[PDB]
């Protein structure tokens, strides 16, 4: 709430130089950190989606501890920030109650943490929502974040397809429970349509609090065990399934459930690739060029073993021809002929270079 | 290349510093003292003639790309020199003093561009011995422009200017010289063991002003310099009188040694007033005292 | 570095099996010639002394 002191900062260009510096520093790691912020609220709901009896508490103290560490870290950063802001233009008040709600949707969290807090989970989800949201907000108060926003959606329209069809799987799970004959084997059918129904829910938490913060590793990791989550609840669907007895329509719900793994793989292949991106969009070539690279390396990590370098120089010259044939038709597409040349004596020297391979 | 590049980018840094001279103002960094400044400005000396030194060696194998690591290396050498500099204008009041620190700055980096051009001669050009001995000279060069830089401040200058004068007078008292009141042994003699004891006495201070204040130890060891001067010129009488001429060169010998002795005393006494924290070297102080006793012994 | 000083020791020891005896000025003139070389060595060896980064880890 206080603003930091703001010792002097002089004229001095240097003196403006070291300042902009700490300021991409400051920006650089409280991104870092809200990030662990959101992955210890994300571990937070695994745990707390267990039973309590096997709830091991302790894990769930550490995320709290670094997010109280951040926190104050948060502070202490984003104050210097909002110093330096107040410097050139002089708006931190924006960031500031950004930081405000992160805190209170932080202590909202912890509010939802005690046991001696009876309330049921998915309000403790509604407030990791909120958190995911208030991060949000943070990390684009400050725009480090939001690469691009496809992604992240994507992602989000994804999951929400899996929740829908996880609800019509439910669907078809309680229709063939009704039709089994035993009673108490659809007891445990329920119990499966249930903690899958939670197991879609804090899916969809996991969505909330993650889109911020796709960056960071650990968030990554956190979906991955939360598809892994699904997953466990995917196989208890299964063995609902395996409960009935002989009928098409378990193996309706089978095929639900396949897709419900499958829509889960591309959701997580979708957000790897987005955290496994290129800052820019797709250049001219790349995998081709990428493809190169993968030979040059393979080739330079071989000496010795021409039974290997016959092979990558085969594909490499492969490739090679690839871009130099669509190099030809770029040039032909090229108007100012000038660089229709410069590509084709580029593409003269690399069927040069294939050669002297050969 | 980016090293000399650099280079470039160090002057428009010295311009700015001269543009702030003009101003008559630097504000220091939150974090930069006058005293982590000379630490800086030290260490930094040490770093970049070590680095130069790579240089030269890099280049006596030539054509290496370590060269250029080494260049790259004395680049952020000149540029931690940059903090130093840069801080030590911004903490000062005399005009003087700010402008001798861009000036030698300016020197330092200008010649090492020298050695950036000319060390990629030699990468380019292998077998020449005469390439060595440029670097070896422009080296020397840069070398020399470093210590005005440390000398830079004034506390520090008179006291190795003192050092260096009683060294010249006992230089200027080593070329055969010899006075005319030859006087008598006994009395001469003894009143050089009492100025040996002095002097000592005096390097005892020294050390303890190295537990102490920086001034105190300019002014104390401008009395040993004073003294060690009477002490030589003891020591030019004692030859003046010496029955033997053997005898006399013995003598002109002891009082050399014992000259080198507080040379390198003092040497190790400014190298120690640039940090009040560097045990090691003030241990090295210490059996710098211990040689000059040595000689004052003998 | 130190091949540098071991190879102007060899030069020393023709040196020291030249200026032996021969009281000759051409002599001398080679033995400082030769202990020049050396002393630039050792000033490089001075100044690798002076690594500051590389010297010293103080207790605390």
């Not at chain 1, 001696?116 to 990390?139: K, M, T």
């Not at chain 2, 003639?49 to 290496?64: M, P, R, T, V």
């Not at chain 2, 005399?94 to 020298?114: E, G, M, R």
Request: overall charge negative; aromatic content about 2%.
């Amino acid at each position: 709430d206080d603003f930091e002191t703001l010792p002097p900062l002089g004229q001095d260009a240097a003196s403006k130089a070291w300042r902009k510096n700490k300021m991409d520093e400051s920006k650089h790691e409280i991104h870092s950190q809200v990030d662990a912020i959101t992955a210890g609220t994300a571990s937070v709901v695994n745990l707390t989606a267990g039973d309590p009896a096997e709830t091991d508490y302790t894990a769930v103290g550490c995320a709290v501890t670094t997010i109280s560490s951040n926190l104050t870290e948060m502070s202490r950063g984003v104050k210097l920030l909002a110093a330096l802001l107040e410097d050139e233009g002089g708006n931190g008040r924006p960031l500031l109650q950004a930081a405000k709600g992160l805190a209170g949707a932080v202590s909202e969290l912890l509010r939802s943490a005690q046991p001696a807090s009876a309330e049921p989970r998915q309000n403790l989800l509604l407030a990791a929502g909120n958190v995911g949201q208030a991060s949000g907000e943070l990390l684009q108060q400050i725009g480090e974040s939001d690469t691009d926003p496809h992604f992240q959606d994507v992602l989000m329209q994804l999951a929400n397809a899996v929740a829908s069809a996880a609800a019509a799987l439910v669907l078809k799970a309680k229709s063939v429970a009704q039709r089994t004959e035993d009673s108490g084997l659809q007891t445990q059918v329920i119990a499966a349509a249930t903690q899958c129904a939670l197991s879609t829910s804090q899916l969809v938490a996991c969505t909330k609090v993650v889109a911020p913060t796709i960056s960071s590793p650990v968030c990554q990791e956190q979906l991955v065990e939360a598809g892994r989550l699904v997953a466990k609840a995917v196989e208890g669907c299964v063995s609902a399934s395996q409960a009935a007895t002989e009928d098409g329509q378990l193996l309706r719900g089978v095929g639900a459930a396949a897709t419900a793994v499958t829509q889960a793989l591309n959701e997580l292949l979708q957000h790897v690739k987005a955290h496994a991106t290129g800052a820019g969009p797709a250049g001219r070539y790349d995998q081709a060029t990428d493809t190169i690279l993968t030979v040059t390396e393979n080739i330079f990590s071989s000496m010795g073993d021409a039974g290997e370098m016959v092979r990558q120089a085969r594909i490499l010259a492969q490739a090679t021809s690839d871009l130099v044939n669509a190099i030809k038709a770029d040039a032909e597409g090229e108007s100012d002929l000038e660089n229709s040349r410069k590509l084709l004596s580029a593409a003269k020297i690399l069927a040069d270079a294939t050669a002297k391979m050969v | 290349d980016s090293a000399l590049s650099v280079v470039q980018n160090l002057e428009k840094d010295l311009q700015e510093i001269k543009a702030a001279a003009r101003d008559g103002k630097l504000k220091p960094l939150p974090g930069e003292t006058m005293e982590k400044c000379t630490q800086d400005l030290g260490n930094s000396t040490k770093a970049v003639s070590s680095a130069i030194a790579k240089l030269l060696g890099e280049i006596a194998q030539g054509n290496e790309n370590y060269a250029g690591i080494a260049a790259r290396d004395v680049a952020g050498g000149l540029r931690s020199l940059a903090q130093a500099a840069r801080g030590v204008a911004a903490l000062t009041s005399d005009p003087a003093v700010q402008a001798i620190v861009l000036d030698t700055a300016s020197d330092v980096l200008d010649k090492a561009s020298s050695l950036i051009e000319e060390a990629k001669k030699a990468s380019g050009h292998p077998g020449d011995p005469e390439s060595q001995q440029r670097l070896a000279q422009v080296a020397k060069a840069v070398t020399q422009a470093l210590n005005r830089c440390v000398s830079c401040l004034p506390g520090q200058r008179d006291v190795d200017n003192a050092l260096r004068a009683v060294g010249d007078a006992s230089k200027r008292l080593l070329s055969d010289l010899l006075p005319p009141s030859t006087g008598t042994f006994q009395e001469a003699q003894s009143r050089l063991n009492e100025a040996a004891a002095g002097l000592n006495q005096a390097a005892t201070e020294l050390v303890q002003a190295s537990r102490g204040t920086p001034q105190d130890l300019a002014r104390a060891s401008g009395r040993f310099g004073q003294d060690f001067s009477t002490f030589l010129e003891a020591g030019v009488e004692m030859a003046g009188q010496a029955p033997s001429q053997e005898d006399r060169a013995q003598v002109v010998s002891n009082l050399k040694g014992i000259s080198m002795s507080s040379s390198k005393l003092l040497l190790a006494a400014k190298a120690l007033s640039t940090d009040p924290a560097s045990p090691n070297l003030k241990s090295q102080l210490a059996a710098a005292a211990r040689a000059v006793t040595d000689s004052i012994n003998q | 570095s130190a091949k540098e000083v071991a190879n102007s020791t060899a030069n020393l020891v023709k040196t020291i099996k030249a200026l032996d005896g021969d009281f000759t000025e051409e002599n001398r003139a080679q033995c400082r010639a030769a202990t020049a070389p050396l002393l630039e060595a050792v000033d490089n060896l001075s100044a690798f002394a002076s690594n500051p980064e590389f010297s010293s880890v103080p207790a605390q």
